Ligand binder design. Sequence first.
Ligand SMILES: [K+]
Lengths: 304, 304, 304
Amino acid sequence: MKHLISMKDIGKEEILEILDEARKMEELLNTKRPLKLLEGKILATVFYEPSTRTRLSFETAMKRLGGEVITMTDLKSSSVAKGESLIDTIRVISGYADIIVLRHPSEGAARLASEYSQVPIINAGDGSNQHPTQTLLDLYTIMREIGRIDGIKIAFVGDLKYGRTVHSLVYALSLFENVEMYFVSPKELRLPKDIIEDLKAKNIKFYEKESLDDLDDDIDVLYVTRIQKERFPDPNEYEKVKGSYKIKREYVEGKKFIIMHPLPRVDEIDYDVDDLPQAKYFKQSFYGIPVRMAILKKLIEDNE
Amino acid sequence: MKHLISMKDIGKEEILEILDEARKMEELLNTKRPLKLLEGKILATVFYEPSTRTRLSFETAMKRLGGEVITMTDLKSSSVAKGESLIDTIRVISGYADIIVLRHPSEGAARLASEYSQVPIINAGDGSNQHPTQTLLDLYTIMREIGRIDGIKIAFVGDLKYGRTVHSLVYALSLFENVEMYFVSPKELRLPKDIIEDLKAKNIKFYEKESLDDLDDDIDVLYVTRIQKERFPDPNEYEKVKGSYKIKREYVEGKKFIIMHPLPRVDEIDYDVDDLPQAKYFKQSFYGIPVRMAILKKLIEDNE
Amino acid sequence: MKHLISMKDIGKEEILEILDEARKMEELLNTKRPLKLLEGKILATVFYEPSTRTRLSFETAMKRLGGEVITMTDLKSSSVAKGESLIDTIRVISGYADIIVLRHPSEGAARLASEYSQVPIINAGDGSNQHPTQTLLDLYTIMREIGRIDGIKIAFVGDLKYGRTVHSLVYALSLFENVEMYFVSPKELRLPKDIIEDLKAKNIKFYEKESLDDLDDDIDVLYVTRIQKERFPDPNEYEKVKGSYKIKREYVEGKKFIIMHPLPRVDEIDYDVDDLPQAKYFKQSFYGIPVRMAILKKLIEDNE
Ligand SMILES: [K+]
């Protein structure tokens, strides 16, 4: 693997390889002894747009591997208004570092960068169209907590129309077997039809549901995403929507599923669900570190 | 010690333990050989409010111990306006790191955080009510330079009414023996009465003084704090105040005391005092590193 | 060498020493094995003004040497409006760190700092009058790519009147032998006369040229700098200027010279020159790391 630009670039087997590697990274972390796997290696964080979350996780992952990190987070005026084009910055930075995590608004930005970069490019959103690492950690969470990915019944709740990370996860799962999908959302925010077509073609068993109550307790994974306010300018109607799709304790009690949420969690899930056994989004967050560790390590070693 | 939230949580003995540990850290630094005490450990700097000073010192302390540091300084809009509540951020970050230094405006913020954190919380101001580490380094300075803390005559000059760090130091000293306190300030900015009550109860010998000249040369330590402009909107009157309480060379010459100042120094002390023997605030600054080292180390090791 | 404040402070021999040291650093980098030369040492980046470029390179250099880095980039209001004077910050930071890279707008800022600093000061622009490290890496590039510095024919294109880095390089080269200089620029932006005097005095063979076509193919090095818009408010005339001095592929083909550019490259050089053999500015960028490594190492070791 030369770069990690989009989930579209890797198959089931290669995904499972990355997951195995992540399980190993997790054990290493459990060791509490200093790891030197990437000692002497430098990760360059290159963000034209902000993402404290993305930066922290990758920075943690790299440092857990004994590696170093240089950071470049503002380029909305630090070089985009300073003149330097993307391809110039990439070239300068691939000369400094050993690997780059890039978050750039322009479409195909990460792909172009990989073309001019002498080091591996990791795409952390362009500007948030394809986020492979988020999708990999989601899959990792499922494997860890459920045992394996094939044969799961997963339900997605929230804005399925603009949920980029849902989109990415949905596609990735279509590469697996016997996966039943449930798409719960406001009628206004249903999964993009083109995707629906992809699922139908791949002959995936799926359902579009209007309500959370339309779900039986056969679902193995509840993956909840955000429903932003920009979708309902009227505070009154927005109350309605939030109320209908907010995950609450009473609805969770005695359920089989685990609950996943890419974070941050704002309104989607009540605070008194956090302490329920099925709540796993914070554990999910942690899993993000071992899989980013595997990703970092793999890209370094695959290319030298 | 699980966390370090407030000086109110530790007694004389435990303070002295921390100080001994700091003396050891200082020797280690004097060695100029790479220290690995916290190799493989990650410190997370979590500030909703800015504090370049706080961040640098802790970051230096952690790195001197061979440890790593991840930084999160803006949360006034990076997650407070991004939606994520404090308790969520703490949970995500305690999953990434091994220890956290937190500076959050809300009262009892650090305490709440420690409740949701799986790792030790260090309170670097909430929003600047209790700063244990500053108070510990102040005490360390006194022990190092004076020999011991008991039996000192210390005078505080400046705004004693809003001097949070004076407040914290004053309380901590009340735990020691034979400590005589002198409180020099504008009548408008005298030490809060409730504190005065605490001192009277603890039967501490203390004096409220109007002028610097009311001090004899029996004082062992001169601890000076800031008198902000917000206290005297009239530039004319503010001239008067500054002039009356500014420490000047001629007043310092031949004095027994050392001069402590938490920094930054703006108007409180003339520049031509810096080079006088009794000037110790810059040495005080350095001492901040060894005691933060001890603090970091202790909290890691006490909890694993 | 106690500090590195200005090129005016070091002679040919000492420059060559630093260059040799840089060649060694470059080999070490080529090794791809973790270097520990500055393990346990802390570099403090102190910028009152912004310079993502400067910071990254030095930070990379220090980390390549196994060292650590603390960063302080905003002081336009973080301590300049927070009260603390430069000399105070320097003293606090020289207590924390082992070496400082300083970028401060005020003239003679770096020099003053070195006076109050207990650790070596590296001047990264004050506010951009003397940048020794840029000038050292430029010289390094020439030695590496040309073989040696003496006897080269170098042409400078762009704004020669406000090109601080050209000024610095020109002076440094005057310390070498048989160096022929060609100064290509708009008549409005010719090399400052006082410098011309220095060259005449040192009896350097040089020419002031109006056009790129006035250059023969005997030039060994083409060093191009920026011509900002502030020099030609009329977009119309600015078109003219840019067009006349922009380096283009057809002009470069079959040329003997290498092309150097301190970066960032905005308008000065066409993108389809990048891939021509004579294009070396990105390699030049990389060379910046080994020479900053040598600089960092030398200053640490010369002072302990
Ligand atoms: K490090």
